[model samples]
Every structure is written in structure tokens, then in C-alpha cells.
Target: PYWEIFTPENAFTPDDKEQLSEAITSIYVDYVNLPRFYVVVLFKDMPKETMYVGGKANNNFVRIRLDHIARQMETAEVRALMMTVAEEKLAPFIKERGYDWEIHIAETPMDLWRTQGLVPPPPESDMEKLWAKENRPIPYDVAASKLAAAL
Candidate 1:
């Protein structure tokens, strides 16, 4: 299947757009062939730092967690490891961009999906909360099956 994207971060400047474009183009050339049909860009202007940890980003992370189950030891293990990897990766990125950013890894897909009777925790303190009341809702399968290691 082709790719669909949602860049919900605040408006991207020409530089920002170009930077991402070049990086992705380079990735395609080095790692993947251009898809026959795909959504190229769906940019949006929003407070990305906060938004990413809040709504759909959390869901997206959850989907990825489920998709990676085959490779991970277990749901919780992936949750813990993804957090460490995200922080390690984001540290240099934040420093270079001069911004503070964080990541949360969902343990189970349900951990990310809406659930009843569970209080949503702020992302900074704990990366486990799915930001929903405990009542396990279905998760969107927006993950790629042929995901590869970094090129």
C-alpha cells in the first residue's frame, strides 16, 4: 500500500519543507523506490511539540508498537525500549534544533487506544499513558509492514 502522512506540526517554512524534502528524497533514492501512488505532503500549522504527545501522535505510536510486536520481546519491553531510543535520538535533535522534545512508548496497543476508568497521564512524567480513559478502543493500522532499519 502507498503511504499517507500527516505533518501536524506548526507551519513549515521553505527551509523546513526543503530540509524534509531533501531528506526524504535521499531516503527514497537510497532505500526505497517511489511508490506508484502516495500522499506526498499534508502539512498543518499547530503546536507540534505538545500535539505530538497528545492525540493522534500517541495513537500512531501505539500502532507502531503493535506492528513491532513480532520483533519485540513483549508489549511492555517494546514500550520501555522505544522510550529509551526516542530520548536518545531526540536529545541530539533537540540540541541541534534548540528545542526540548520528548517521546512516549505505548506498552500495549490498548495502552495507546482509548480506555475507560484510567486517568490519562501527562506525557512528560510518564510515557505509558495512552491519554484516554480506560475503555480500550480500536487502533488505526497506519503502520508499514515493510519497515526497514535506517539507511
Candidate 2:
């Protein structure tokens, strides 16, 4: 999940939110194989003068909170990879509007979080099949073939 707030007196349209939501989730799934459905993104339109930088109230700041799915994804390499992805996904909306664009990534330990009354399995485990059958990013023919094989 994400919490995104921006200054600069901007208001995103409903279409903007829908497009950004998919784009951001695509970055996570493309890089880490996290299911797209697992991502949550929220955007807030804030008063331009609410943030302070250099002790001055300013409208040039944007803050992002990113939720890292597991402990292993908290490493430098993984974060560095996501940094670029964040740019690709966010730059269109962020560039030219802000001088300070801040992103903070936080992770909850693997077994510490639960959804639908179950802790999601690691991506590598067949245990993931419980949820992946619905949320996994598989091509139609490939998924159909797998189902055929299983049957």
C-alpha cells in the first residue's frame, strides 16, 4: 500500500488516479512478482502551504510512503531498483511541480501481516497457489495449460 501526498495545489482527476494506480502496481509486480491486486495506492490533494522546507512553508514538496511486502525486499539493491521504478511511475506527475520529492519505504515482517484470515505465502512456494490462481500474472494460454495439466 502507499500513501502519497503532494503540495503545489494540484488536484488529480478520477482518471488520473485510475491510471496511476495501475502504473504503480505494474512497477512492483514487474520487479518483484508481487501480485498486482495486492498493491494499494492513495493520493491526497493538500493545501500548498502545509509543508515546510528550510523552515519555510512551501509548495514544492511531495511525500510518498511505500509498503514493502517482505523483509528480503528491504535491501539496498531491491530499494535501488524500486527507486528507478518509482521515477518511471511518478515522474510524469511529479516533475516540474516540486523541488523535493521524498519517498520512504517501510516493510512489515513476513508472518506479521495477514489478509483474508491467512498470511500470504512466499512467491516461490506452491502454497502461494492458494491465492496465485486468481491474482498471479500468467498469460491466458499458460494458465489454461496449467489448469489442464492439473486436472
Candidate 3:
């Protein structure tokens, strides 16, 4: 999962970025059970002059774009749950700050994703658990054997 945060310069300090990043990661790592390292957060600080909303410069507006390749929500209820959780986590940073913000999520096919030249293991599998523990990708055969022996 990748998150792109576009904000006007000075909207967030470095500390704000770190805290918000962790909060976003927890949603996936704790709730969705994705590997910690799979979550990427990039803050793009834009110049006030370069950002516009409704054809006018708006320094108070923030736009968030999220890309998901690991797993997609399977049902409407699950989607609603994810969005609600995200909004709750983001409230302190965006909403409470009095910034008008919009967020949209896009999911790509998992088959197109690769890490360190190896495809990720199946979700919730033993091999995947090992990757989550290591917080990095390992050779598939090596991971398979390691988990196989542990069984």
C-alpha cells in the first residue's frame, strides 16, 4: 500500500508526518495484517502558489491518494469499515487542523506487484507470516522451507 499526501508547505511539521505515518500504518499492519514494510507514506509538500482548489489557490486544501496492491476489500461493509477507520485516524491531522481534505483509494491487481524481484506470499500463509516478522521480502523457496520446518 502506498499513500501520497499532498499538502501546502508548512502545513505539517516533521513530527506530524511521523505520527500520522504510524497511525496510517497501524490500520494495515494491525487491522489488515499486512507486513509493516509494505506500507509506504510519502509527503509531498507543495508550494502555495502551485496548489489550487476549484480553480483558485487554496493552501488550506489537502489531497490524499492511496494505492493498494496487497489486498482489496471484498465487500461494501468491509470497504465502509476501512474508510471509517481511516477517517477516524486522520481526523487529528487533517480535520482538526481545519484543512479541507479529500482521500481516494485505488486498488491494483496483486499479480502485478513484486518486491525484491520476488512475488509476495499468499495472505495469512505461514510464509507470509515470516515475511511480516522479518518486515522484508525473502526468497520464496527459502521462506517456504523455513516455515515448513517450523510446522
Q: Best-fitting candidate, measured by TM-score?
A: 3
List TM-scores for all candidates, in order: 0.30, 0.73, 0.90
Better of 1 and 3 by lDDT: 3
Off by over 4 Å in 1: 1-11, 35-39, 47-95, 100-151
lDDT by residue for model 2 over 78-133, one digit each (tens)? 76877778877887776644456778777666667666555565554444543454
Q: How well does candidate 1 match the true structure in TM-score terms?
A: 0.30
Q: In model 1, how many backbone clashes occur?
A: 8
What lDDT score belongs to each candidate, Candidate 1 first? 0.32, 0.65, 0.88
Candidate 1 residue lDDT tens string, 1-151: 1112233353346676655444433432332232211113333344434345544343222111112111123467655654555445334323355543333222233244332333322222122122122223224322321122111
CA lDDT for candidate 3? 0.88
Worst 10 residues of 2 by lDDT: 136-145
lDDT of 3 by residue, 8-127 (tens): 888889999999999999999888688988999999998877877789988888899999888988999999998999999899999998999999999999889888888888777777
Query: What ordering of candidates by lDDT runs from best to worst?
Result: 3, 2, 1
- Candidate 2's TM-score: 0.73
* Native-referenced Cα lDDT, model 2: 0.65
Best by lDDT: 3
Candidate 3 Cα misplacement greater than 4 A, ranges: 142-151
In terms of lDDT, which candidate is stronger, 2 or 3?
3
